[PDB]
Each structure stands twice: as C-alpha cells, then as structure tokens.
Amino acid sequence: FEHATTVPNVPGIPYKALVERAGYAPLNLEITVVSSELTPSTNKEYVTCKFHTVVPSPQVKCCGSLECKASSKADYTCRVFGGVYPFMWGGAQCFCDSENTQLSEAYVEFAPDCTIDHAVALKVHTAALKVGLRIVYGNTTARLDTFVNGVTPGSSRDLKVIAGPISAAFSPFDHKVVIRKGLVYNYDFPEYGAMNPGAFGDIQASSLDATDIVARTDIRLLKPSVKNIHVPYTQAVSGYEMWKNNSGRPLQETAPFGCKIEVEPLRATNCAYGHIPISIDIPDAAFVRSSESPTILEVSCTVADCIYSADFGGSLTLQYKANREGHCPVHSHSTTAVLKEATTHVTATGSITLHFSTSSPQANFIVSLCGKKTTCNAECKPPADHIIGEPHKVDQEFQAAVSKTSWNWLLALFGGASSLIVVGLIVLVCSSML
Amino acid sequence: FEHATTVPNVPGIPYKALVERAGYAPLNLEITVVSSELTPSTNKEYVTC
Ligand SMILES: *[C@@H]1O[C@H](CO)[C@@H](O)[C@H](O)[C@H]1NC(C)=O
Ligand SMILES: *[C@@H]1O[C@H](CO)[C@@H](O)[C@H](O)[C@H]1NC(C)=O
Numbered sequence: 001f002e003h004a005t006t007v008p009n010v011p012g013i014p015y016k017a018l019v020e021r022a023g024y025a026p027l028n029l030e031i032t033v034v035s036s037e038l039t040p041s042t043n044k045e046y047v048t049c050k051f052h053t054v055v056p057s058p059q060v061k062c063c064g065s066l067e068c069k070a071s072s073k074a075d076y077t078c079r080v081f082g083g084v085y086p087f088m089w090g091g092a093q094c095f096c097d098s099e100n101t102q103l104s105e106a107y108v109e110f111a112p113d114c115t116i117d118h119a120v121a122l123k124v125h126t127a128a129l130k131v132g133l134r135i136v137y138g139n140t141t142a143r144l145d146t147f148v149n150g151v152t153p154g155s156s157r158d159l160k161v162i163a164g165p166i167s168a169a170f171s172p173f174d175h176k177v178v179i180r181k182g183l184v185y186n187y188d189f190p191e192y193g194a195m196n197p198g199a200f201g202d203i204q205a206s207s208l209d210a211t212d213i214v215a216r217t218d219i220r221l222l223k224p225s226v227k228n229i230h231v232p233y234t235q236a237v238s239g240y241e242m243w244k245n246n247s248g249r250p251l252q253e254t255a256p257f258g259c260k261i262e263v264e265p266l267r268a269t270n271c272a273y274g275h276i277p278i279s280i281d282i283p284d285a286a287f288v289r290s291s292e293s294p295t296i297l298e299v300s301c302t303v304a305d306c307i308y309s310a311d312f313g314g315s316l317t318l319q320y321k322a323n324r325e326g327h328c329p330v331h332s333h334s335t336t337a338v339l340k341e342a343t344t345h346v347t348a349t350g351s352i353t354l355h356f357s358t359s360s361p362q363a364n365f366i367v368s369l370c371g372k373k374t375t376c377n378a379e380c381k382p383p384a385d386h387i388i389g390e391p392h393k394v395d396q397e398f399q400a401a402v403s404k405t406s407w408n409w410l411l412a413l414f415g416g417a418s419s420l421i422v423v424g425l426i427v428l429v430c431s432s433m434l
Numbered sequence: 435f436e437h438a439t440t441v442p443n444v445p446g447i448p449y450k451a452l453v454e455r456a457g458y459a460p461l462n463l464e465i466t467v468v469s470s471e472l473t474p475s476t477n478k479e480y481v482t483c
Contacts, residue, residue: 383456
C-alpha cells in the first residue's frame, strides 16, 4: 500500500504520519531525516601555489653576440646584456675587454611545499541530494539512504521509498569555487590561459606534477650593476599569498541554511531549506486486520497548560472507551500541531496523556486516536524563554498565528463596519422607495 | 524558573505561595522570616563617664 506525503528537509525533527487502508487498521508512519548532503558534479581547471622563480646560471661568452631561444618553460623571461665583464672568485672570467655578453634566464616552478599548500579551482554545476531516512513503521526500525531524484528506489530489506524532487535547491556553491586545505571559498578565479600578476591563479597547471606549467608573473631581468656574476631580477609578489591575505571567510562560516562544507568529495552536509516528497510503499506484513485492532467507541480530549513553543510544550488528556486490550497509534491532523508519541496501549475505559508542539496561540486541532477523530480546542501561552536550543518542529501558517480573541476583535470591528454599510444601504433603498 | 512575590516582615508566620509552571506541576512555596536584623552603620563620636 503506497502512501504519498511531504517531509520537511530539516535533519532531526521527526515527522509523524498515519497510513490507513480501507479494510486494515490505521498504522503509524515515521519519516525522519538523519543526514542530507549536497554533492555537486565538479571539474578541475587548475591547481595553484607559491612559485619557486628558480634562476638558472648565467650564460656568459666573451665578446661573441649570443641570443637565447624561446623555451616553452613556465613564465620564461630571458635577456642579453652587453658590455659585461664578470667577476666571480678568481678574478676576471672573460679575457676579452669590453664586448662580452651575459645571458640572464628566469622561469617559475611550483615550490617544494606545493603538495600541501595548494589551492584547487573548481567549477560547480547543479547538485543532487542523498538523504538518509529512518522509518519506524509498525515499531520496526528501518534505516536507509536514498537519492532525491524521484526515480531511485531505496535499498531496504522490505521497504520501497521514492524521494520526489526538491521544491527549490539553493546551491550554496557558486559557479566557481576554490578549495584550500579543506576550506572552500566562493572565488571568481580567472580562466585557464588567463593570468594576472599579483592575483590568484597567477601560476597554473593541470596537476601538481604536470610538466605544462603556465604562469604570467611580472618578472623582469635587470642589468648587473656590480661587477659580479649574479642575476639581478625583480618580480611581482605571488598572488597566492595576496589571496590568502584577503581570502575572507570560507564557506564553512558564510553559508545559508546552516550546513557544513566537507571536502573529498566536495559536499554540503545537513542542509535544511525545503521539503522532500516521499512516496513510500509500506509492506503488507505491518498492516493488520481492522477486527484485530481495538476500535474506540467514544473518545474525548482536553488540554492542560498549553505552552506554544519549539519544545514539546503542551499536554492533552484523552478519555477513551476502548473495547478490548491492544495498542494502536495516535496522530494530530493539523499542520500547526505535532504529537510527540506514536502509539498508545489501550486496555479499556481509561485516560492517557500526550505531548504536542504548536506554533499558534490557539489550539484548535483534530486528534485521531486509533482511527477515531475528535477535535480539541484550548488556549496556549507564549513561552518565557526567549531563546531555545532546538529548532521549531512546526511552522506558522499565518492564519492560525492570529489568536482566537484577536480574531474575535478584528472580525467584530470588520463585521460591525460591514453591517453598518449594509444598514446604510438598506436605509438608502427604503428612502428611494419613498 | 524565577518566582517573584512579596512577603510580610513578621517573624515566624509562614507565608504560602503557589508556583504554577506551564510545563510542570504547581508547587507549594513556603517562605518564613525566621529572624531579621536592622544593623545601622555607626561611628564613635566620643566616650564619656
Ligand atoms: C595584507 O597584508 C599586509 C602585510 O603587508 C597586512 O598589513 C594587512 O593587514 C593584510 N590585509 C589587508 C586586507 O590589507
Ligand atoms: C509492534 O509492536 C507489537 C507489540 O509490541 C508487536 O507485536 C508487533 O510485531 C510490532 N509491529 C510489527 C509490524 O512488527
């Protein structure tokens, strides 16, 4: 017997329901989400880190004009200097007086510590959910994990679940993200093949050990002022360190709906934003005969000290007139009230107490005990505690949020004004008759 | 829970109250002033005999 419903997305906050076949007894149904991860399909453009800006040895020849071929190495900057006359230890290095040529070479390369201190640039497409459910139908615990696509049944021993598509997934990741050491940033990195000096992604490669390193650091070779054999060069600062200087806060601190970002794989676990349609096919082994279940001949309810809040605040007493011994579920058939308990053992002619949570100052909600429905009407007080450590289990519907007496005053003034208009118009009609 | 109430300053004479909570049962509250003392802040001006 399939049953369709819509569960809130929030992890925790167990969700109650009552399934009911025409010839079978009403049966408890529990749907609760223990985990929910958003795993998007991501591809990798480039890795980046500190460059080493290694400088090879000078190529000095003594009064012969030489030029350097354009090497394919990363950020290759090469220059020739005439009129040099080098000195390293041991005196002059060229015999020939004042026409010697020095060749200065410079190129960049990943630092030795780039295996840990590297940032990986990702493009993030649309994400899909993989939510874990616990189903407590017929006091039989069933833990499962299922995708939210509407086409994937959940692997269970005797249960079939379909998770309908999300109303609106919000995708916390932007189209371009950057991952550094488990910290995820929504950064608009430049495209591969586009580099700016002193900016993020100034040096790029397909992998950490890739040969095709590419960079456009603003490196310039200068003429050696002192008569030695050093290579004087200047270069713009690494954009990796300049990005770490003002990276801002990562996605683990700046993310909507309060869900935590994890890496390997990139995912956003325990997000709470929408609603999942659940089509669940309860096996018939849990459905029991209506004759076996003790029906309730008469039931009445009262509410004592209703405190409407996020906690299970509010107690209701049910006076039942059961016929035979057994146990059968309870349920609350209002969107504003959620009952704490699932089933109740009833022998005959007794009293039970139940706990519920509401977001409305008026408690006008129908309780179904074991098949039979009776409504309960009472008043609920606002809580004294301003801040509570657990989330609300019900949502305000904006019509039950207005209290019963405030509804009475507002409807009384509106009805008095409207009836005053009606009596004015009928006096007009009576006067026009004359 | 914080209960704010008003008790007479009579020694002895137990004072009754009810602590009603929306999430718990009402509780008996007894307040008895077993003793009091009104100690002034004094200074010695002089001593004579
Ligand atoms: C950047 O680094 C400098 C050090 O040169 C430091 O003074 C500064 O606070 C950092 N952050 C910003 C936002 O400039
Ligand atoms: C629910 O509990 C009852 C009594 O504890 C037990 O007999 C029954 O097997 C449980 N339900 C199912 C569907 O197994």
